[PDB]
Write a protein that holds these residues in place. Structure first.
Motif, PDB file in Angstrom:
ATOM      1  N   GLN A  25       0.860  -1.052   0.089  1.00  0.00           N
ATOM      2  CA  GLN A  25      -0.093   0.128   0.037  1.00  0.00           C
ATOM      3  C   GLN A  25       1.077   1.393  -0.076  1.00  0.00           C
ATOM      4  O   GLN A  25       1.710   1.501   0.939  1.00  0.00           O
TER       5      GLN A  25
ATOM      6  N   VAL B  17       0.070  13.198  -5.351  1.00  0.00           N
ATOM      7  CA  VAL B  17      -0.635  11.980  -5.469  1.00  0.00           C
ATOM      8  C   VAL B  17       0.538  10.571  -5.556  1.00  0.00           C
ATOM      9  O   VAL B  17       1.586  10.835  -6.203  1.00  0.00           O
ATOM     10  N   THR B  19       1.111   6.522  -5.754  1.00  0.00           N
ATOM     11  CA  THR B  19       0.647   5.285  -6.280  1.00  0.00           C
ATOM     12  C   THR B  19       2.035   4.249  -6.332  1.00  0.00           C
ATOM     13  O   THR B  19       3.011   4.892  -5.694  1.00  0.00           O
ATOM     14  N   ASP B  21       3.839   0.648  -8.434  1.00  0.00           N
ATOM     15  CA  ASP B  21       4.089  -0.196  -9.596  1.00  0.00           C
ATOM     16  C   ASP B  21       3.931  -1.605  -9.050  1.00  0.00           C
ATOM     17  O   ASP B  21       3.700  -1.933  -7.840  1.00  0.00           O
ATOM     18  N   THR B  52       2.065   7.530 -12.973  1.00  0.00           N
ATOM     19  CA  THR B  52       0.619   7.575 -12.249  1.00  0.00           C
ATOM     20  C   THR B  52      -0.333   6.942 -12.969  1.00  0.00           C
ATOM     21  O   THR B  52      -0.785   5.936 -12.225  1.00  0.00           O
ATOM     22  N   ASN B  55       0.481   3.010 -13.147  1.00  0.00           N
ATOM     23  CA  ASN B  55       0.197   2.341 -11.886  1.00  0.00           C
ATOM     24  C   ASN B  55      -1.059   2.356 -11.605  1.00  0.00           C
ATOM     25  O   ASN B  55      -1.846   1.249 -10.884  1.00  0.00           O
ATOM     26  N   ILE B  56      -2.137   3.330 -11.585  1.00  0.00           N
ATOM     27  CA  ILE B  56      -3.538   3.054 -11.587  1.00  0.00           C
ATOM     28  C   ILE B  56      -4.071   2.105 -12.517  1.00  0.00           C
ATOM     29  O   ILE B  56      -4.804   1.153 -11.953  1.00  0.00           O
ATOM     30  N   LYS B  61      -4.079   1.391  -6.804  1.00  0.00           N
ATOM     31  CA  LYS B  61      -4.115   1.963  -5.421  1.00  0.00           C
ATOM     32  C   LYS B  61      -3.438   3.378  -5.411  1.00  0.00           C
ATOM     33  O   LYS B  61      -2.782   3.725  -6.483  1.00  0.00           O
ATOM     34  N   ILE B  62      -4.219   4.098  -4.592  1.00  0.00           N
ATOM     35  CA  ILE B  62      -3.879   5.829  -4.711  1.00  0.00           C
ATOM     36  C   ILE B  62      -3.932   6.519  -3.158  1.00  0.00           C
ATOM     37  O   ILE B  62      -4.959   5.967  -2.702  1.00  0.00           O
ATOM     38  N   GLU B  63      -3.282   7.333  -3.018  1.00  0.00           N
ATOM     39  CA  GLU B  63      -3.529   8.112  -1.950  1.00  0.00           C
ATOM     40  C   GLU B  63      -3.104   9.735  -2.493  1.00  0.00           C
ATOM     41  O   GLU B  63      -2.078   9.809  -3.255  1.00  0.00           O
ATOM     42  N   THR B  80      -9.253   3.912  -4.384  1.00  0.00           N
ATOM     43  CA  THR B  80      -9.066   3.071  -5.601  1.00  0.00           C
ATOM     44  C   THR B  80      -9.399   4.025  -6.725  1.00  0.00           C
ATOM     45  O   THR B  80     -10.274   4.650  -6.610  1.00  0.00           O
ATOM     46  N   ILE B 110     -10.982   8.830  -8.812  1.00  0.00           N
ATOM     47  CA  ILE B 110     -10.790   8.288  -7.548  1.00  0.00           C
ATOM     48  C   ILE B 110     -11.629   8.132  -6.786  1.00  0.00           C
ATOM     49  O   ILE B 110     -12.551   9.074  -6.373  1.00  0.00           O
TER      50      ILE B 110
END
Lengths: 119, 119
Positions: A25, B17, B19, B21, B52, B55-56, B61-63, B80, B110
């Motif tokens: 994560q 942002v 993410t 890989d 980015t 990876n998406i 997964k994202i923050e 997500t 998102i």
């Protein structure tokens, strides 16, 4: 590796730090105390038992971003990080906190491997 | 879900942002078009095939972090993400871009799952 243009951003902008936990994560957080130790090393004061520290202690992977929102500039620094709670980097961290924040619980050290323009 | 303070930061600060890989490497970058769609959804205009986006599409997964450097306020949105190239979100993104930037290649969407105060 780290040029003058980079130093200028590092000194005026907030370091945003990305790490990853053991379960894959991503985490993101600011570290206000992030600063250059030499031309291939950053350090920061670790005041917390937070997610950035636990990730670093787990696998060492890190990316740090500095962005000038207005002037439209930034860099991403990629490297490997470690946490120490004793020794010269830790002592310097304690001295750096004087008159600014509480005593650090630890010092985060980042060895910079690759640098990317963000523009 | 979203307070006015949350909206002010989102409206006033740069979205950073994070993410990850497929190999577990964290990535970090700014998304200046990041904005709210509803109380649990952000969208952004994706103009690249950068990390980015890759990876998406790989794992979702994202923050996202928004930090007001001077009031010492901030929030981290976790969730997500997906990338779309047609449909209502994309047509909105295209429309939004007019007078601001080039035509998007896609829209990032998102789905917010949790929110953390960065205090």
């Amino acid at each position: 590796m780290i040029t003058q243009e980079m130093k200028d951003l590092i000194n005026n902008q907030l370091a945003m730090v990305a790490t990853v936990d053991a379960k894959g994560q991503p985490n993101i957080g600011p570290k206000r105390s992030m600063r250059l130790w030499d031309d291939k090393t950053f350090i920061y004061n670790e005041n917390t038992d937070g997610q950035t520290r636990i990730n670093i202690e787990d696998n060492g992977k890190i990316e740090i971003a500095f962005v000038d929102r207005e002037r439209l500039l930034g860099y991403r620094f990629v490297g490997t990080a470690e946490i120490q709670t004793e020794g010269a980097y830790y002592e310097a961290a304690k001295k750096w906190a004087q008159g600014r924040m509480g005593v650090p619980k630890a010092v985060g050290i980042i060895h910079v491997e690759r640098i990317f323009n963000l523009q």
